[PDB]
Enzyme design. Structure first.
Site, PDB file in Angstrom:
ATOM      1  N   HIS B 120       1.923  -9.839   1.658  1.00 17.74           N
ATOM      2  CA  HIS B 120       2.732 -10.656   2.518  1.00 17.74           C
ATOM      3  C   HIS B 120       3.178  -9.811   3.684  1.00 17.74           C
ATOM      4  CE1 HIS B 120       3.812 -13.559  -0.975  1.00 17.74           C
ATOM      5  NE2 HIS B 120       2.775 -14.006  -0.294  1.00 17.74           N
ATOM      6  N   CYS B 131      -1.151  -9.120  22.096  1.00 16.94           N
ATOM      7  CA  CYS B 131      -2.376  -8.363  21.812  1.00 16.94           C
ATOM      8  C   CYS B 131      -2.724  -8.197  20.338  1.00 16.94           C
ATOM      9  CB  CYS B 131      -2.343  -6.996  22.494  1.00 16.94           C
ATOM     10  SG  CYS B 131      -1.391  -5.702  21.661  1.00 16.94           S
ATOM     11  N   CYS B 169       6.062  -5.015  22.754  1.00 21.70           N
ATOM     12  CA  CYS B 169       4.914  -4.132  22.636  1.00 21.70           C
ATOM     13  C   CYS B 169       4.990  -2.969  23.609  1.00 21.70           C
ATOM     14  CB  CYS B 169       3.673  -4.916  22.991  1.00 21.70           C
ATOM     15  SG  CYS B 169       2.158  -4.179  22.441  1.00 21.70           S
ATOM     16  N   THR B 212       7.514 -11.154 -12.025  1.00 17.74           N
ATOM     17  CA  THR B 212       6.908 -12.475 -11.722  1.00 17.74           C
ATOM     18  C   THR B 212       5.972 -12.796 -12.916  1.00 17.74           C
ATOM     19  OG1 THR B 212       5.627 -13.824 -10.094  1.00 17.74           O
ATOM     20  CG2 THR B 212       5.102 -11.492 -10.302  1.00 17.74           C
ATOM     21  N   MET B 238      11.832 -11.302 -16.631  1.00 14.82           N
ATOM     22  CA  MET B 238      13.007 -11.843 -17.313  1.00 14.82           C
ATOM     23  C   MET B 238      12.904 -13.275 -17.814  1.00 14.82           C
ATOM     24  SD  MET B 238      15.587  -9.359 -16.623  1.00 14.82           S
ATOM     25  CE  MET B 238      16.013 -10.288 -18.118  1.00 14.82           C
TER      26      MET B 238
END
Ligand SMILES: *C(=O)[C@H](CCCC)CC(=O)O
Ligand SMILES: [Zn+2]
Lengths: 8, 262
Positions: B120, B131, B169, B212, B238
């Site tokens: 991600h 750019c 940039c 997860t 968990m």
């Protein structure tokens, strides 16, 4: 391309 | 049974470890999702989209600045470390260990992990809107306009920073507006990364799922691939599982994981 969370 | 797991661990020559928000949670990193995970008025769903950014890039950057700044006090927990050290130890033995993480906080990096796939993206990379260049950036604050901004108080005044002063940039000809190199809602994953991960998960002979579960995104894109080859899969999180039930170690990754990998 793969949607994150499958887009849900 | 743990011993049973370790018998695999001992044999395994190519381990892949998939990590989710549970592990960043244990280091005190906010996810901003579900109960009490608000930032000012909003939740992540609201702000982490291309529309939000088009509409109000000052606000979105305030949000992401805050997230960058709170990382200065959250450290990697034992799970992060127990991984990184395991990678090191096993690499010395010619055995591989890769991390595929949905987390964007660079905690695995700071723990010393090396072969990491950030699917991600990362809070400490930018992308030029004009750019497309991707630079690491850890500057606190990322640009002067944001200094002391992005407070999370519901009642905080919007900083309403003009776009030209938001991060830009550096390639002199360009000067495009930078955005966080993070995958937002409604965007795709980088297929190059997915193709590498695919390759890694085909190679692997033991898979770990951490903070997860395999049933849910994004573990679910993959574990099917590994499991259908007959490879063992161990979850550390968990969530409960029912009386009548690929291993599961309920509890904090901070506690469960280091004994597992020693
Ligand atoms: C998507 O959920 C995105 C980052 C991946 C979750 C850690 C939302 C965000 O936090 O910007
Ligand atoms: Zn640029």
């Amino acid at each position: 391309g793969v949607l994150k969370e499958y887009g849900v | 049974d743990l011993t049973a797991f370790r018998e695999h661990f001992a044999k395994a020559k190519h381990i892949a470890i998939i990590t989710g928000a549970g592990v960043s949670a244990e280091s005190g990193v906010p996810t901003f999702r579900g109960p009490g995970g608000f930032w000012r008025k909003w939740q992540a769903q609201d702000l982490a989209t291309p529309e939000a950014f088009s509409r109000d890039p000052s606000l979105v950057w305030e949000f992401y600045h805050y997230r960058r700044e709170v990382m200065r006090s959250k450290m990697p927990n034992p799970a992060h470390l127990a991984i990184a050290e395991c990678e090191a130890r096993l690499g010395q033995q010619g055995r591989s260990v890769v991390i595929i993480t949905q987390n964007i906080d660079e905690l695995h990096h700071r723990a010393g992990s090396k072969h990491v796939y950030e699917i991600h993206g990362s809070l400490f990379k930018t992308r030029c809107m004009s750019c497309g260049e991707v630079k690491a950036n850890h500057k606190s604050p990322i640009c002067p306009a944001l200094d002391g901004k992005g407070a999370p108080d519901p009642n905080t005044k919007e900083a309403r920073i003009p776009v030209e002063l938001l991060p830009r940039c550096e390639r002199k000809s360009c000067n495009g507006l930078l955005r966080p190199h993070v995958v937002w809602f409604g965007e795709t994953l980088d297929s190059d990364i997915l193709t590498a991960v695919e390759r890694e998960l085909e190679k692997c002979d033991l898979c770990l799922v951490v903070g997860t579960s395999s049933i849910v995104y994004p573990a679910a894109m993959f574990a099917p691939q590994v499991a259908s080859r007959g490879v063992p899969v161990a979850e550390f999180n968990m969530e409960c599982t029912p009386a009548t039930q690929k291993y599961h170690f309920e509890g904090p990754c901070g506690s469960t994981l280091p004994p597992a990998l020693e």
